[PDB]
């Protein structure tokens, strides 16, 4: 569970991301595709080249869903309900891949927020990404 | 994979009692029932709505025997799994887009099927030998991913 | 989320385990130590030889906790709170190991329940074990 | 492990700018804060209750320096990580009883620290090369487990 301290850390870090959220979402996807090549099997229909507008467009959707989740930290299951159905019944992404994207999102935040990414904020962000991942896979079976 | 001569005989001995077509259909059907997201590659197989629909589906059965037949032939090359599954690895990555995590899930479902099928003959040491094999085959199939 | 059909399947399968819960618990541990040797790192203070009193005794404690979870399947977080605190604050077993013990428990039940281990029951037991593992690691951080 | 010329150049060039003493303390401290259960191997280190206590702990800093120091030696032997870490692998298994999964966690925390420290210089291609290296070191260290 996210403590009051965790929620404050997450809203503070994401607040600093601000309008750069979409750019960071695309960077996190590029990091994941390069570091963990197996994740590319879910995007055979995408041009995965660096600078690809399809990855930049998808990065923005992922980042917007995260912004929505931060705004509804106390009510994530309902805020992310359509996304849980989508991943559980259509996309069917194996659960292990959520840990790979979460790691790459963390690396992207570390690379962009040097002053904000303290050890305490790092721990809170990691807990937040595991909760989002838990919600998105709650309807798998 | 490194198997002691005793682990190899344990694997081969039990395998000679396996009805490959039957166990193949059983393993793939259970994979699709227990981990439903694996159904993503099989939309053309038709009705996969319930556990009974999956187990009785003739296309699931036919694919199960194809998958287990290649696994069976691989047992004769336990010392060279990577070279034996190189082409199948490339096919699964480049054309089929199968996340390698699926191979690990199938391997664990196969171990449960063998335990259900053999009961007490599927001893803890025999399971350990089969665990190394399914991990070895999963790694061999994922080696050409890029 | 365990559905009503899952709870019905788990209760039926466990009822059948019955008085063998302790010996099946001991067998699942032995299968884990042999198949996944890294799990032995948490038991350096145990005589892990086949049939030892410590493994049979520990196997019995694991099975009782599992029978308790089956008896209170609608309220697992509360039923297992003491065990949840024990694993999060004292034992500190890495979460990956719960997947390994769950697989070995599933193999033990398959080998002992020829009539009951149908595909639907197999899916229900796997979900049940994943739920128990989730409750036991819920207080880790 | 097998790295392409550019990946080996990326790993080596970045490492020449790493102050092992400071980076090691950061990586170990963050491991203990972000994944608290890893504190089970360090009961004799003192105060580890708060993030500030862990990060300022002199014993956490001294140990981090030892760990990354051994890690450094491995970068000089990327072609033979298993031979390089065989003795340390046995030590961690037989005397320390450290679950190898901890090596994976430390490797990922190290990648986060490098990104935090280097910013835009830790590009996606550089991270990919480091992920291969940390997975290789983790595997080399788990190799002698039995
Ligand atoms: C932080 C976790 C994640 C979030 C918030 C997220 C969110 C989303 C969103 C917002 C969409 C777009 C739905 C729409 O069009 O309205 C989507 C699509 C998709 N996601 Fe996820 N996702 C996550 C993790 C994953 C992972 C781990 C993978 C696989 C490696 C993945 C693969 C996909 C795929 C293939 C699509 C379809 C893209 C397309 O065809 O346009 N997702 N996701
Ligand atoms: C021990 C594991 C496996 C082995 C040895 C194996 C083997 C094979 C073989 C021999 C083929 C035929 C290739 C050809 O037509 O040239 C095939 C096809 C295929 N496999 Fe795998 N496979 C395994 C696991 C999996 C898993 C777990 C999935 C996904 C859940 C999967 C999905 C597919 C698909 C979709 C095809 C194409 C079927 C068709 O076109 O009719 N495989 N596999
Ligand atoms: C189905 C999941 C599990 C259940 C139900 C469970 C249950 C228990 C119970 C009931 C105890 C006894 C506590 C007492 O004596 O008061 C215990 C102790 C312990 N468990 Fe867990 N456990 C599970 C998974 C794990 C895993 C995966 C490992 C490690 C591979 C593990 C390692 C330990 C250790 C080392 C102890 C202490 C044993 C001793 O020194 O006596 N547990 N657990
Ligand atoms: C990057 C991987 C790692 C390397 C290269 C490494 C290296 C070392 C080395 C060189 C020693 C010093 C032994 C001596 O002074 O004789 C050691 C000790 C130790 N390591 Fe590891 N280690 C690694 C990861 C870990 C992890 C992740 C844990 C647990 C979270 C761990 C726990 C320990 C402990 C408990 C000691 C003993 C400390 C003491 O003297 O009290 N190590 N390690
Ligand atoms: C297909 C693929 C990619 O399959 C994989 C991939 C990765 C792995 C292992 C992996 O790399 N793990 C990983 C990678 C990157 C980051 C992390 N981080 C963590 O998982 C952090 C963590 C750990 C335990 C946690 O447990 C608690 C109880 C605290 C929780 O979940 O909240 C939470 C978070 C883990 C295994 C198979 C493969 O074959 O290569
Ligand atoms: C220390 C150790 C053991 O480290 C690792 C590293 C990665 C792994 C990966 C692993 O082997 N996974 C594994 C092994 C055996 C059985 C299983 N089974 C499952 O995970 C079943 C499963 C899968 C997805 C699930 O997701 C949903 C969303 C359904 C859920 O959580 O409920 C739930 C259950 C998984 C294991 C050990 C090592 O180095 O050997």
Swiss-Prot record, chains A, C:
Effect seen on changing residue 141 to H: In Suresnes; O(2) affinity up
Tissue: Red blood cells.
Organism annotation: Homo sapiens
PANTHER family: HEMOGLOBIN FAMILY MEMBER, HEMOGLOBIN SUBUNIT ALPHA
Effect on the protein upon substituting residue 113 to H: In Twin Peaks
Phenotype when changing residue 74 to G: In Chapel Hill
Annotated effect of mutating residue 20 to Q: In Le Lamentin
Name listed for the protein in its UniProt record: Hemoglobin subunit alpha
Effect caused by changing residue 88 to S: In Loire; O(2) affinity up
Function: Involved in oxygen transport from the lung to the various peripheral tissues.
Result of changing residue 1 to E: In Thionville; O(2) affinity down
From Swiss-Prot, chains B, D:
Effect of residue 117 to R: In P-Galveston
Effect of residue 23 to G: In Miyashiro; O(2) affinity up; unstable
PROSITE patterns cross-referenced by the UniProt entry: GLOBIN
Effect of residue 92 to D: In J-Altgelds Gardens; unstable
Result, substituting residue 97 to Q: In Malmoe; O(2) affinity up
Outcome of mutating residue 146 to Q: In Kodaira; O(2) affinity up
Outcome recorded upon mutating residue 28 to P: In Genova/Hyogo; unstable
Any single GO BP term: cellular oxidant detoxification
N6-acetyllysine, modified sites: 59, 82, 144
Binding locations of (2R)-2,3-bisphosphoglycerate: 1-2, 82, 143
Phenotype upon changing residue 116 to L: In Vexin; increased oxygen affinity
Impact upon substituting residue 77 to R: In Costa Rica
Effect of residue 146 to D: In Hiroshima; O(2) affinity up
Family listed: Belongs to the globin family.
Disease: Heinz body anemias: Form of non-spherocytic hemolytic anemia of Dacie type 1. After splenectomy, which has little benefit, basophilic inclusions called Heinz bodies are demonstrable in the erythrocytes. Before splenectomy, diffuse or punctate basophilia may be evident. Most of these cases are probably instances of hemoglobinopathy. The hemoglobin demonstrates heat lability. Heinz bodies are observed also with the Ivemark syndrome (asplenia with cardiovascular anomalies) and with glutathione peroxidase deficiency.
Protein name: Hemoglobin subunit beta
């Amino acid at each position: 569970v996210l403590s009051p301290a965790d929620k404050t850390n997450v809203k503070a870090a994401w607040g600093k991301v601000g309008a750069h959220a979409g750019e960071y979402g695309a960077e996190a996807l590029e990091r994941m595709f390069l570091s963990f090549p197996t994740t590319k099997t879910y995007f055979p229909h995408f041009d995965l080249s660096h600078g690809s507008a399809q990855v930049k467009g998808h990065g923005k959707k992922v980042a917007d869903a995260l912004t929505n989740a931060v705004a509804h930290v106390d009510d994530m299951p309902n805020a992310l309900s359509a996304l849980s159905d989508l991943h559980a019944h259509k996309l069917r992404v194996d659960p292990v891949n959520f840990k790979l994207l979460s790691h790459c999102l963390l690396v992207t935040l570390a690379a962009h927020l040097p002053a904000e990414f303290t050890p305490a904020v790092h721990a809170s962000l990691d807990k937040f990404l595991a909760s989002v991942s838990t919600v998105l896979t709650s309807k798998y079976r | 994979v490194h198997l002691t001569p005793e682990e190899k005989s344990a694997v081969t001995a039990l395998w000679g009692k396996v009805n490959v077509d039957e166990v193949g259909g059983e393993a793939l059907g259970r994979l699709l029932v227990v981990y439903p997201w694996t159904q993503r590659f099989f939309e053309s197989f038709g009705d996969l709505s319930t556990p009974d629909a999956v187990m009785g589906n003739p296309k699931v059965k036919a694919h199960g025997k194809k998958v287990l037949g290649a696994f069976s032939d691989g047992l004769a090359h336990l010392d060279n799994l990577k070279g034996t599954f190189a082409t199948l690895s490339e096919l699964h990555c480049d054309k089929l887009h199968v996340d390698p995590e699926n191979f690990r899930l199938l391997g664990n479902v196969l171990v449960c099927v063998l335990a259900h099928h053999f009961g007490k003959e599927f001893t803890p040491p025999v399971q350990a030998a089969y665990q190394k094999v399914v991990a070895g085959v999963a790694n061999a199939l994922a080696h050409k991913y890029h």
